């Protein structure tokens, strides 16, 4: 049986890490 | 030994984190590694017991 | 379709991104990641292999599963409707075990098939990140990260795993 725990909300970050 | 017992553990091309056992022939015992969830090779066991039974 | 479809427990989770944890060797560890949206919890099939999720004293069974698509949803059918558009940058909300979530921006390439085209993410996150959402600039999930290939030079490339919303 699996459990879950919240980690983040879904958002685009204007200063996310570049680059892929 | 079977020969697959002598092959290094294989995480594979998926990004889950599933702890498994492999047989480490140099150490002469089973150790843990991270399996990714897809494309498992044969040196990959859910338990130390089962790992030692087939590769020990 | 059938006259009296069976019923599973509802995924009573706030919307957002979740670590999925499994009891295994050494105890409880993060096996992957999932996305709760519109009352449905979405992840990659290889993460859970269709195992029951437990939360709030309830046992959650998968409502839809496809090994072929490597996707699975709990509480209802697939709700992630956004599609990646070729030439547009995405972010991955990478949720690595033991680490704070972090967004990474990238321009996807493509995987070629006789079927059609699937986006390709050349980013290499730690094991346990499978199910991390790939998102567009609107904050919509275009797919999930973690089913990929290791390239000849040891680089990792993930597919953008997606299916049509129900």
XYZ file of N, CA, C and O in Angstrom, chain C residues 18-142:
500
model
N 2.531 15.544 -5.306
C 2.711 14.668 -4.137
C 3.893 13.731 -4.285
O 4.120 13.183 -5.361
N 4.633 13.517 -3.200
C 5.542 12.375 -3.133
C 4.716 11.124 -2.893
O 3.789 11.133 -2.078
N 5.057 10.040 -3.589
C 4.423 8.742 -3.367
C 5.440 7.894 -2.615
O 6.582 7.768 -3.057
N 5.034 7.349 -1.475
C 5.941 6.588 -0.619
C 5.526 5.132 -0.483
O 4.336 4.805 -0.431
N 6.516 4.250 -0.454
C 6.252 2.831 -0.357
C 7.036 2.234 0.785
O 8.180 2.618 1.027
N 6.418 1.277 1.459
C 7.094 0.456 2.451
C 7.945 -0.569 1.681
O 7.433 -1.309 0.837
N 9.251 -0.578 1.926
C 10.142 -1.488 1.205
C 11.336 -1.872 2.056
O 11.267 -1.879 3.282
N 12.439 -2.176 1.393
C 13.678 -2.407 2.099
C 14.025 -1.076 2.771
O 13.838 0.003 2.181
N 14.437 -1.176 4.028
C 14.846 -0.046 4.873
C 13.694 0.758 5.480
O 13.934 1.634 6.304
N 12.460 0.474 5.086
C 11.330 1.241 5.601
C 10.598 2.000 4.509
O 10.531 1.545 3.359
N 10.040 3.149 4.883
C 9.234 3.945 3.965
C 10.103 4.917 3.172
O 10.816 5.748 3.741
N 10.025 4.815 1.852
C 10.813 5.666 0.975
C 9.974 6.221 -0.187
O 8.946 5.646 -0.564
N 10.423 7.334 -0.749
C 9.739 7.917 -1.895
C 10.062 7.094 -3.130
O 11.235 6.996 -3.529
N 9.028 6.512 -3.725
C 9.199 5.738 -4.954
C 8.964 6.567 -6.210
O 9.531 6.283 -7.270
N 8.154 7.613 -6.088
C 7.823 8.436 -7.240
C 7.008 9.640 -6.818
O 6.994 10.009 -5.638
N 6.302 10.209 -7.794
C 5.598 11.472 -7.668
C 4.269 11.370 -8.425
O 4.146 10.607 -9.386
N 3.276 12.129 -7.971
C 1.975 12.165 -8.628
C 1.374 13.556 -8.564
O 1.859 14.429 -7.828
N 0.323 13.751 -9.347
C -0.300 15.057 -9.499
C -1.795 14.879 -9.234
O -2.474 14.058 -9.893
N -2.288 15.624 -8.248
C -3.717 15.655 -7.944
C -4.330 16.834 -8.687
O -3.899 17.977 -8.511
N -5.325 16.543 -9.526
C -6.036 17.578 -10.265
C -7.483 17.156 -10.462
O -7.771 16.050 -10.965
N -8.386 18.048 -10.060
C -9.826 17.837 -10.204
C -10.297 16.544 -9.561
O -11.065 15.770 -10.148
N -9.821 16.309 -8.344
C -10.208 15.137 -7.577
C -9.617 13.818 -8.039
O -10.024 12.768 -7.567
N -8.657 13.861 -8.963
C -8.061 12.617 -9.477
C -6.553 12.683 -9.312
O -5.933 13.714 -9.598
N -5.978 11.577 -8.840
C -4.539 11.481 -8.645
C -3.883 10.718 -9.800
O -4.240 9.570 -10.093
N -2.936 11.387 -10.452
C -2.317 10.921 -11.687
C -0.846 10.598 -11.446
O -0.116 11.422 -10.901
N -0.402 9.433 -11.905
C 1.029 9.122 -11.868
C 1.408 8.186 -13.033
O 0.593 7.927 -13.927
N 2.661 7.754 -13.046
C 3.143 6.792 -14.026
C 2.944 5.381 -13.497
O 3.125 5.098 -12.298
N 2.538 4.493 -14.393
C 2.238 3.116 -14.017
C 3.426 2.423 -13.344
O 3.240 1.769 -12.307
N 4.635 2.575 -13.897
C 5.812 1.910 -13.302
C 6.100 2.326 -11.854
O 6.805 1.618 -11.128
N 5.575 3.470 -11.441
C 5.756 3.929 -10.051
C 4.972 3.082 -9.041
O 5.522 2.670 -7.991
N 3.700 2.821 -9.338
C 2.829 2.129 -8.383
C 2.508 0.689 -8.761
O 2.070 -0.100 -7.908
N 2.679 0.374 -10.044
C 2.229 -0.892 -10.642
C 0.777 -1.229 -10.283
O 0.432 -2.397 -10.104
N -0.063 -0.202 -10.152
C -1.467 -0.394 -9.818
C -1.785 -0.724 -8.363
O -2.912 -1.134 -8.061
N -0.818 -0.560 -7.466
C -1.040 -0.804 -6.031
C -2.035 0.197 -5.438
O -2.210 1.300 -5.942
N -2.685 -0.199 -4.350
C -3.664 0.661 -3.706
C -2.947 1.824 -3.008
O -1.903 1.635 -2.408
N -3.494 3.024 -3.120
C -3.001 4.137 -2.316
C -3.859 4.216 -1.067
O -5.063 3.956 -1.124
N -3.239 4.548 0.059
C -3.989 4.751 1.292
C -3.818 6.186 1.747
O -2.707 6.730 1.712
N -4.931 6.805 2.128
C -4.939 8.185 2.610
C -6.235 8.440 3.376
O -7.301 7.969 2.971
N -6.141 9.164 4.490
C -7.334 9.556 5.261
C -8.138 8.358 5.762
O -9.353 8.450 5.916
N -7.466 7.233 5.997
C -8.137 5.989 6.368
C -8.900 5.300 5.240
O -9.719 4.412 5.490
N -8.635 5.703 3.999
C -9.330 5.142 2.840
C -8.347 4.448 1.905
O -7.193 4.858 1.810
N -8.810 3.376 1.265
C -8.003 2.656 0.292
C -8.452 3.032 -1.118
O -9.602 2.800 -1.504
N -7.528 3.637 -1.867
C -7.782 4.160 -3.217
C -7.284 3.182 -4.284
O -6.099 2.870 -4.361
N -8.217 2.678 -5.081
C -7.891 1.766 -6.175
C -7.754 2.564 -7.450
O -8.410 3.597 -7.583
N -6.891 2.113 -8.391
C -6.856 2.831 -9.677
C -8.187 2.763 -10.431
O -8.800 1.685 -10.524
N -8.632 3.898 -10.965
C -9.825 3.931 -11.816
C -9.539 3.678 -13.282
O -10.417 3.252 -14.025
N -8.325 4.003 -13.703
C -7.917 3.790 -15.071
C -6.420 3.458 -15.049
O -5.654 4.083 -14.330
N -6.010 2.454 -15.821
C -4.589 2.118 -15.892
C -4.203 1.625 -17.272
O -4.930 0.860 -17.884
N -3.034 2.056 -17.748
C -2.500 1.535 -19.006
C -0.998 1.298 -18.885
O -0.206 2.243 -18.766
N -0.608 0.031 -18.903
C 0.825 -0.312 -18.888
C 1.493 0.202 -20.175
O 2.641 0.679 -20.159
N 0.766 0.107 -21.282
C 1.278 0.531 -22.587
C 1.613 2.028 -22.615
O 2.681 2.432 -23.101
N 0.717 2.843 -22.072
C 0.950 4.296 -21.954
C 1.800 4.693 -20.754
O 2.220 5.865 -20.638
N 2.043 3.713 -19.884
C 2.727 3.907 -18.585
C 2.085 4.992 -17.721
O 2.787 5.809 -17.134
N 0.751 4.973 -17.614
C 0.031 6.006 -16.874
C -1.086 5.365 -16.081
O -1.601 4.311 -16.464
N -1.484 6.017 -14.996
C -2.493 5.440 -14.127
C -3.157 6.556 -13.343
O -2.498 7.533 -12.961
N -4.462 6.451 -13.149
C -5.143 7.468 -12.348
C -6.015 6.825 -11.261
O -6.588 5.760 -11.463
N -6.095 7.494 -10.112
C -6.840 7.028 -8.936
C -7.954 8.019 -8.618
O -7.723 9.225 -8.597
N -9.156 7.508 -8.354
C -10.289 8.353 -7.975
C -11.193 8.695 -9.147
O -12.349 9.127 -8.956
N -10.678 8.513 -10.361
C -11.438 8.807 -11.583
C -10.576 8.629 -12.828
O -9.396 8.278 -12.725
N -11.159 8.895 -13.999
C -10.418 8.824 -15.260
C -9.442 9.991 -15.399
O -9.461 10.934 -14.600
N -8.612 9.931 -16.429
C -7.538 10.911 -16.651
C -8.104 12.316 -16.820
O -9.016 12.517 -17.629
N -7.575 13.284 -16.069
C -8.062 14.673 -16.134
C -7.068 15.686 -16.712
O -7.412 16.854 -16.859
N -5.843 15.258 -17.016
C -4.828 16.203 -17.512
C -4.961 16.353 -19.024
O -4.516 15.495 -19.783
N -5.612 17.434 -19.441
C -5.995 17.642 -20.837
C -4.982 18.399 -21.697
O -5.055 18.320 -22.929
N -4.049 19.121 -21.075
C -3.079 19.924 -21.828
C -2.124 19.071 -22.674
O -1.735 17.978 -22.274
N -1.780 19.588 -23.853
C -0.858 18.940 -24.784
C 0.330 19.839 -25.044
O 0.169 21.049 -25.243
N 1.519 19.248 -25.067
C 2.711 19.980 -25.441
C 2.672 20.336 -26.923
O 2.317 19.502 -27.765
N 3.039 21.580 -27.214
C 3.084 22.097 -28.580
C 4.548 22.209 -28.979
O 5.335 22.866 -28.296
N 4.909 21.547 -30.075
C 6.275 21.576 -30.590
C 6.818 22.999 -30.661
O 6.136 23.912 -31.127
N 8.042 23.185 -30.176
C 8.689 24.491 -30.226
C 8.468 25.352 -29.002
O 9.026 26.444 -28.903
N 7.649 24.881 -28.064
C 7.418 25.638 -26.832
C 8.206 25.061 -25.659
O 8.308 23.841 -25.503
N 8.783 25.943 -24.846
C 9.539 25.492 -23.683
C 8.591 25.021 -22.589
O 7.429 25.437 -22.528
N 9.088 24.116 -21.755
C 8.318 23.583 -20.630
C 9.139 23.720 -19.349
O 10.340 23.990 -19.394
N 8.493 23.541 -18.199
C 9.229 23.337 -16.968
C 8.903 21.970 -16.403
O 7.780 21.478 -16.561
N 9.885 21.348 -15.761
C 9.613 20.163 -14.953
C 9.667 20.588 -13.490
O 10.641 21.221 -13.056
N 8.617 20.274 -12.739
C 8.635 20.461 -11.288
C 9.231 19.189 -10.680
O 8.519 18.231 -10.348
N 10.555 19.181 -10.574
C 11.280 17.997 -10.141
C 11.144 17.844 -8.635
O 11.495 18.746 -7.889
N 10.597 16.711 -8.199
C 10.441 16.428 -6.785
C 11.338 15.234 -6.423
O 10.909 14.088 -6.384
N 12.607 15.529 -6.176
C 13.572 14.500 -5.824
C 13.433 14.081 -4.366
O 13.181 14.930 -3.499
N 13.634 12.780 -4.077
C 13.620 12.314 -2.684
C 14.559 13.134 -1.801
O 15.670 13.456 -2.219
N 14.087 13.495 -0.613
C 14.899 14.257 0.350
C 15.196 15.705 -0.001
O 15.894 16.391 0.751
N 14.657 16.192 -1.120
C 14.968 17.546 -1.590
C 13.719 18.394 -1.760
O 12.629 17.858 -1.980
N 13.884 19.715 -1.666
C 12.806 20.634 -1.983
C 12.489 20.587 -3.484
O 13.397 20.492 -4.312
N 11.194 20.643 -3.836
C 10.851 20.733 -5.256
C 11.545 21.912 -5.928
O 11.727 22.980 -5.309
N 11.950 21.711 -7.177
C 12.579 22.767 -7.948
C 12.122 22.710 -9.405
O 12.004 21.625 -9.977
N 11.861 23.878 -9.993
C 11.477 23.962 -11.400
C 12.673 24.119 -12.310
O 13.564 24.943 -12.038
N 12.664 23.361 -13.404
C 13.736 23.404 -14.401
C 13.102 23.667 -15.748
O 12.152 22.973 -16.138
N 13.604 24.672 -16.457
C 13.063 25.014 -17.759
C 13.919 24.412 -18.879
O 15.149 24.395 -18.787
N 13.257 23.900 -19.915
C 13.950 23.240 -21.020
C 13.158 23.362 -22.325
O 11.948 23.558 -22.306
N 13.849 23.260 -23.458
C 13.180 23.099 -24.742
C 13.182 21.617 -25.105
O 14.251 21.030 -25.315
N 11.992 20.995 -25.159
C 11.971 19.577 -25.521
C 12.338 19.324 -26.983
O 12.082 20.171 -27.851
N 12.964 18.174 -27.225
C 13.103 17.638 -28.577
C 11.939 16.695 -28.835
O 10.891 16.806 -28.197
N 12.109 15.753 -29.756
C 11.043 14.795 -30.029
C 11.576 13.382 -30.189
O 12.686 13.180 -30.693
N 10.778 12.416 -29.735
C 10.963 11.011 -30.069
C 10.128 10.713 -31.302
O 8.966 11.127 -31.383
N 10.720 9.989 -32.246
C 10.043 9.606 -33.481
C 9.493 8.188 -33.377
O 10.142 7.300 -32.816
N 8.290 7.986 -33.906
C 7.684 6.655 -33.987
C 6.861 6.556 -35.272
O 6.551 7.578 -35.900
N 6.526 5.324 -35.662
C 5.569 5.054 -36.743
C 4.149 5.473 -36.341
O 3.312 5.753 -37.204
N 3.891 5.502 -35.029
C 2.643 6.030 -34.468
C 2.550 7.536 -34.748
O 1.781 7.977 -35.611
N 3.354 8.305 -34.011
C 3.440 9.759 -34.150
C 4.587 10.293 -33.309
O 5.539 9.564 -33.016
N 4.495 11.559 -32.906
C 5.573 12.190 -32.142
C 5.252 12.434 -30.679
O 4.135 12.815 -30.313
N 6.276 12.234 -29.860
C 6.216 12.469 -28.426
C 7.379 13.393 -28.060
O 8.492 13.216 -28.561
N 7.108 14.389 -27.217
C 8.151 15.289 -26.730
C 9.242 14.541 -25.982
O 8.991 13.480 -25.413
N 10.449 15.103 -25.992
C 11.622 14.485 -25.381
C 12.333 15.484 -24.473
O 12.829 16.511 -24.942
N 12.438 15.150 -23.192
C 13.031 16.043 -22.188
C 14.441 15.583 -21.835
O 14.611 14.542 -21.207
N 15.448 16.356 -22.235
C 16.829 16.004 -21.909
C 17.250 16.583 -20.549
O 18.062 17.502 -20.459
N 16.675 16.024 -19.486
C 16.995 16.378 -18.108
C 17.101 15.101 -17.289
O 16.312 14.161 -17.477
N 18.087 15.066 -16.394
C 18.438 13.847 -15.687
C 18.294 14.041 -14.178
O 19.232 14.456 -13.500
N 17.113 13.747 -13.651
C 16.875 13.911 -12.222
C 17.124 12.612 -11.475
O 17.212 11.548 -12.094
N 17.244 12.700 -10.147
C 17.495 11.513 -9.317
C 16.338 10.501 -9.389
O 15.189 10.886 -9.597
N 16.648 9.200 -9.240
C 15.607 8.179 -9.077
C 14.620 8.582 -7.990
O 15.025 9.108 -6.939
N 13.334 8.409 -8.293
C 12.257 8.822 -7.401
C 11.476 10.008 -7.931
O 10.473 10.400 -7.332
N 11.927 10.550 -9.066
C 11.291 11.727 -9.687
C 10.211 11.357 -10.685
O 9.448 12.217 -11.125
N 10.131 10.079 -11.054
C 9.059 9.632 -11.942
C 7.686 10.101 -11.475
O 7.337 9.923 -10.300
N 6.911 10.671 -12.402
C 5.595 11.236 -12.079
C 5.631 12.752 -11.874
O 4.582 13.396 -11.791
N 6.834 13.328 -11.811
C 6.981 14.804 -11.703
C 6.354 15.462 -12.938
O 6.606 15.022 -14.059
N 5.531 16.512 -12.739
C 4.828 17.096 -13.882
C 5.687 17.976 -14.776
O 6.578 18.701 -14.312
N 5.392 17.880 -16.062
C 5.956 18.723 -17.088
C 4.853 19.708 -17.406
O 3.728 19.298 -17.679
N 5.168 21.005 -17.355
C 4.127 22.035 -17.434
C 4.382 23.106 -18.491
O 5.531 23.358 -18.860
N 3.305 23.713 -18.984
C 3.438 24.853 -19.890
C 3.342 26.168 -19.119
O 3.158 26.166 -17.895
N 3.450 27.285 -19.835
C 3.518 28.601 -19.203
C 2.204 29.036 -18.540
O 2.188 29.992 -17.745
N 1.118 28.329 -18.853
C -0.178 28.536 -18.192
C -0.291 27.793 -16.865
O -1.297 27.921 -16.162
N 0.717 26.993 -16.532
C 0.670 26.182 -15.320
C -0.154 24.911 -15.487
O -0.649 24.349 -14.501
N -0.311 24.458 -16.728
C -1.047 23.230 -17.014
C -0.079 22.083 -17.300
O 0.979 22.288 -17.899
N -0.462 20.888 -16.879
C 0.423 19.723 -16.967
C 0.276 19.103 -18.363
O -0.807 18.639 -18.723
N 1.353 19.129 -19.151
C 1.349 18.547 -20.488
C 1.815 17.092 -20.490
O 1.706 16.398 -21.488
